[PDB]
Every structure is written in structure tokens, then in C-alpha cells.
Design a protein around this ligand. Structure first.
Ligand SMILES: O=C([O-])C(=O)[O-]
Ligand SMILES: [Fe+3]
Length: 324
């Protein structure tokens, strides 16, 4: 059958079209195929899947939690893994990247400018805001406003700029897709690189995906929880938290989870890491982290009928619930 993949905005749509075309060039007419459904935000994708208008979309773990809530109740079916095929990692590190010598520690973030990957995402929001919660000025609810008040300007993609204007000060409109150049891991990093923000809440691989030369990376550092700074290569001993890997989600009823796995498992063999000169699942000339994360090395099938809370784990679920 055909898996209707939900692509968010034009860059992902282009990659999705290529995914469909290349799969059809190596997969038999009776094999798994992919169709593309374009949406403006992951939120529209979640709704589309619940409404039987699409079948699959890859989501950051914080969003996987949101997708599980009523009335969507989507479930994780295929997880990304990082690191390498030999040593698959079903988690990653949330870090706070800053420029060398900017003069401030984690406990001095008040009044600084922040670059977030997006509202509700693991490394860019849930983890850092959860750690800074008590530092935020009262009233702490709504959370978005308290965060806007704490920093002196930010970019929080997907936030409502009408109600929380300061959250889009660094990226007018707070676009929830790659149409917003400061959206996502690499978008938040660019926000820091360009000088718009003072800190970028991203993952441990982010700076390495954007600066190939160590000499350039040496101009950046990481904020550690003990209020000290360390080189970007020392993230294992200077991170905010470890979080679950991104996962493809689907409906619980008539969700096609078996076909989604068949599609992706065959796809990673044909177009996975370093497999093809024609197409790549984990990179693209059209942008970074389109459909799947560039840092992913493959996919693993989620255990039978597992729901979001169980997949995420008690530690991360507690982190989200405590923040809220
Ligand atoms: O984890 C995050 O912040 C993301 O995926 O954007
Ligand atoms: Fe993420």
C-alpha cells in the first residue's frame, strides 16, 4: 500500500517528492510506496493523521507527547537512532551553545537573548525552560509570557507572536517550519551565529553539523549546570539533559504501522547513511533535518502497541509534567 507522509513546508515537500520518486525507481510495483501531503506546521500534520488525511510524520519527543493527548491520541511507531549502526543511540543530549568570552553562566541568563528550536521541543524548550522555571518572574503562567519576560528578546518558533511578541523578536512571526530561517536545531544555531541571540538551546551534534572546521567551533562554548563553561566537544560532561530520540507517529486504528516500518526499513537500506549516490534519507541539498534528522543513522521499530508515555519513559514524562 501507500504511506501518506506529512511534509512541513516547501523544503520538506521537495525532499518528500524525491523520496517518492527514488523509492519508485528501486522498489517493485507491489512494494511500499510513499505519497506526500504538504502542511504548514507539524500541528496540522498531527490533525491530518488523526483525521485519516495522512499517515505518518516524524516528531521531536516533546511533540510526540503532545500528539498522544486527546483528541489526536497518536502513537510512536518507528524511532530514529543516532551515533552509528554499530552503537545505536535512542537518545541525544540537549545543550546550551554560546559564543566564547560572552561573559555569562547558566545562572546569569536573565536578560540575555535566546534562540530556541521551537515551542514544546525537547532540547530547545522543555529541557531548558524546565531548568529555568523557578528563575522566571511571577506570574509564571502562561509560561510563554514568563519566558518572554525573563529574556530580553527571543526566537521561539511556533509561539503566538500576537500574544507573546517578545518571543519572536529574533525571528518575526515565529514561523513553525523551515520557512523561518531560525526554526529547528540549525535555525537556532544560525540565530546565535548571526548575533541575534546570546544562547542557542540545541543538541550536541548541532554545531558540528554547521561548522566543519575546529578552529571555527573553538569560537563557541557550552553552558554547564554547575555554572561553568566547557568546549563544545565536551557535551557529555556539559549538557542540560538526555532526551528520547525523535519518532514517527501514526494512528492507533488503521494506522498502517506495519507498512510504515516496511517502507522505512527498506528505505534505510536503499538510501540510508552512505548507501546511495542518488538519494539520502538523512541529508538533503534542500536543507537540514528535513523529514528526519540529519544526525540520524537509521530506524528501529517501536515495540507492539506502545503508547507515547511508555515510549518516552517516566523520567522525560515527569520532566514535561513538572514544567506544566
Ligand atoms: O529537540 C529539539 O529542540 C528539536 O528537535 O527541535
Ligand atoms: Fe529534538
Amino acid at each position: 500500500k501507500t504511506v501518506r507522509w506529512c511534509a512541513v513546508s516547501e523544503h520538506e515537500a521537495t525532499k518528500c517528492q524525491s523520496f517518492r520518486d527514488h523509492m519508485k525507481s528501486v522498489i517493485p510495483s507491489d512494494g511500499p510506496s510513499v505519497a506526500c501531503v504538504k502542511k504548514a506546521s507539524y500541528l496540522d500534520c498531527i490533525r491530518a493523521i488523526a483525521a485519516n488525511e495522512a499517515d505518518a510524520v516524524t516528531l521531536d519527543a516533546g511533540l510526540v507527547y503532545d500528539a498522544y493527548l486527546a483528541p489526536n491520541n497518536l502513537k510512536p511507531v518507528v524511532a530514529e537512532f543516532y551515533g552509528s549502526k554499530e552503537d545505536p543511540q535512542t537518545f541525544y543530549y540537549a545543550v546550551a551553545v554560546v559564543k566564547k568570552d560572552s561573559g555569562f553562566q547558566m545562572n546569569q541568563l536573565r536578560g540575555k537573548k535566546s534562540c530556541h528550536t521551537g515551542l514544546g521541543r525537547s532540547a530547545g524548550w522543555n529541557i531548558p525552560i524546565g531548568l529555568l522555571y523557578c528563575d522566571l518572574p511571577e506570574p509564571r503562567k502562561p509560561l510563554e509570557k514568563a519566558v518572554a519576560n525573563f529574556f530580553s528578546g527571543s526566537c521561539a518558533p511556533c509561539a503566538d507572536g500576537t500574544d507573546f511578541p517578545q518571543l519572536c523578536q529574533l525571528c518575526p512571526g515565529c514561523g513553525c517550519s523551515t520557512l523561518n530561517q531560525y526554526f529547528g536545531y540549525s535555525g537556532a544555531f544560525k540565530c546565535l551565529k548571526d548575533g541575534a541571540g546570546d544562547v542557542a538551546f540545541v543538541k550536541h551534534s548541532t554545531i558540528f553539523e554547521n561548522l566543519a572546521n575546529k578552529a571555527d567551533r573553538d569560537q563557541y562554548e557550552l553552558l554547564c549546570l554547575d555554572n561553568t563553561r566547557k568546549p563544545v566537544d565536551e557535551y557529555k560532561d556539559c549538557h542540560l539533559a538526555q532526551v528520547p530520540s525523535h519518532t514517527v507517529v501514526a494512528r492507533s486504528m488503521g494506522g498502517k504501522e506495519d507498512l510504515i516500518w516496511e517502507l522505512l526499513n527498506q528505505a534505510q537500506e536503499h538510501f540510508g547513511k552512505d548507501k546511495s549516490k542518488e538519494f539520502q534519507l538523512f541529508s538533503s541539498p534542500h536543507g537540514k533535518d528535513l523529514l528526519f534528522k540529519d544526525s540520524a543513522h537509521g530506524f528501529l521499530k517501536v515495540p507492539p502497541r506502545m503508547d507515547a508515555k511508555m515510549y518516552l519513559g517516566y523520567e522525560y514524562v515527569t520532566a514535561i509534567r513538572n514544567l506544566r
